[PDB]
Amino acid sequence: GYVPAVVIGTGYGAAVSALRLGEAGVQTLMLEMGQLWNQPGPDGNIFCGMLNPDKRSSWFKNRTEAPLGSFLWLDVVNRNIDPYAGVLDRVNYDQMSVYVGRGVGGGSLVNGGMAVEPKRSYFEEILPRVDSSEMYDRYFPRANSMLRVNHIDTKWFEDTEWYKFARVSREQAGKAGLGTVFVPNVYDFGYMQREAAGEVPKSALATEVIYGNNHGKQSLDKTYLAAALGTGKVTIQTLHQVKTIRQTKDGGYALTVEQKDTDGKLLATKEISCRYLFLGAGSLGSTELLVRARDTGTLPNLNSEVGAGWGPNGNIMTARANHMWNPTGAHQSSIPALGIDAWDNSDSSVFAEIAPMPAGLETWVSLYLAITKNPQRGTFVYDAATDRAKLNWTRDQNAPAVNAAKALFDRINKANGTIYRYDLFGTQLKAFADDFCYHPLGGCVLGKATDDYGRVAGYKNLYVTDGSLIPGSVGVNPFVTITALAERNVERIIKQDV
């Protein structure tokens, strides 16, 4: 049926948009292809942990997979599973695997919670048409408050066994003249301290994050989406995937929407129409919908920039072997708290998470997720034969990202007399994982596929809200930027258009 506003997806861009629409009195329907994650499963928990993955871990796969970096220790717990509407989707393209969340809350369900504002000078470089003063004065603060960002207690961090891994990398980086920074988070650090004291059920301290956190993590279902539902003007329909978008002959937009069960069986195909249409299906999902609509003729006035300008936020994973005297600990919180900030906006820039590992026994490995500045971009092209967007990215396009990560970690290895691990990402010698992405950015870039507020070029009352807007790189973990930009955009849209 008809609803004034439809929001596709329930990640960061979608959740912000729906809250503000509802507060403005606009009846809004959110369509989410994944589940509402609120049913206790066979272990009594909503989500599986990293040491007990089951079908809940995976979006329609037939075998569980180890978290990247941990195959050597966690393959032993992998099992065959029924294809199911699980929470983490590894989306495989030709030469890149992009990991995304599936469910009410999108990537907020599966992410590490790291809530980081980009460097203002870098923001100004990547988005020169946007007023940076409003962003830093108004929208970034609004996002940090709404997201429930909080900060780890430094004394607890210094003392706890659960962050030994972070302190070891801090010390090693320091010998190379590199400093660390604390990373704010949406995981409640007060709750985490109580986990360590045995006072509340563990989640971060029980090897949970990438398949969801049963406690502690303030994902969007608890923050923006709860508030959106609280307006009385927003509803969310789950296991509903939008397939096609057209402009109706009488104005507005019409969607074909498939309803499935959790086994992926098609239950119904529905037509849903609206006056205002907001895409929050992610870098992958929003871009796919729009390239499909352009190339199948249902939104024929979309421009050539739709599909373009994708990058993986310079994501590279690597690992160092510590000296025997620098164990990283068997007990590592699943939520990172420290990063190495070597980002100066130059091509050598690196901002690297000090990543925990879930093995639960001593391995001496330090793991890092580097964010780099690599100008290479890919393009989503529509394949009409299979009705899918394909991402034209090649592995060699990550060479500059590998080079920057390697130059930084080579400094740390030189200062400490350590070497890389070469065995964490497959049997072939490979110290740098260069074909994954947790932070997909672009495909519907702000100001190129859209105007400076995400209004899709060629169309009225059609908006993109999410990571597809960002031009490939933000230099930090991206969700705070997506959230703040979405706050800016929807406020202007409600004022001028609605």
Ligand X SMILES: Cc1cc2nc3c(=O)[nH]c(=O)nc-3n(C[C@H](O)[C@H](O)[C@H](O)COP(=O)(O)OP(=O)(O)OC[C@H]3O[C@@H](n4cnc5c(N)ncnc54)[C@H](O)[C@@H]3O)c2cc1C
Return the active site residues.
353, 439
Is 13 annotated among the ligand-binding residues?
yes
User: What is the rounded distance in angstroms from the CA atom of residue 64 to the CA atom of residue 93?
Assistant: 19
C-alpha angle 380/437/66, rounded to 5°?
A: 130
Binding region for ligand X (CB under 6 A) out of 139-147, 168-176, 281-289, 401-409: 281-289
Among 184, 467, 472, 475, binds ligand X (CB under 6 A): 467
280 near ligand X, rule: CB under 6 A: yes
34 near ligand X, rule: CB under 6 A: yes
Cα–Cα distance between 290 and 294 in angstroms, integer?
A: 6
Q: Is 242 annotated as a binding residue?
A: yes
Contacts for 450-453: CB closer than 8 Å, 24+ residues apart: 452/129, 452/130, 453/488, 453/489, 453/492, 453/493
Q: Has 179 been labeled as part of a binding site?
A: no
The answer to whether 111 is a known ligand-binding residue is: yes
- Rounded to whole angstroms, the Cα distance separating 262 from 283 reads 24
CB of 101 to ligand X, least distance (A): 5
Question: Which residue, 32 or 491, is less far from ligand X as judged by CB?
Answer: 32
Q: Could you say whether residue 397 binds ligand X (CB under 6 A)?
A: no
x-or-dash string of contact with ligand X, 164-183, rule CB under 6 A: --------------------
As measured in angstroms, the least distance from the Cβ of 232 to ligand X is 23
β-bridge pairing 28-31 and 2-8:
parallel
Which 326-385 positions form the footprint of ligand X (CB under 6 A)?
A: none
Q: Is 111 in the site for ligand X (CB under 6 A)?
A: yes
What are the CA-CA distances from residue 441 to residues 100, 312, 339, 430 (Å)? 12, 6, 21, 25
Q: Is the dihedral of CA 35, 41, 45, 49 positive or negative?
A: negative
Among 101, 184, 356, 443, binds ligand X (CB under 6 A): 101
Confirm or deny that 107 is annotated as ligand binding: yes
Per the rule left: phi > 0, alpha: psi between -120 and 50, beta: everything else, 212 is: left
Q: Does 210 bind ligand X (CB under 6 A)?
A: yes
Distance in Å, CB of 323 to ligand X, minimum? 29
Which residues of this protein are in contact with ligand X, per CB under 6 A? 8-14, 31-34, 99-103, 106-108, 110-114, 210, 241-242, 280-283, 285, 289, 438-439, 466-467, 477-479, 482
Residue list for the binding site for FAD: 12-13, 32, 107, 111-112, 114, 242, 467, 479
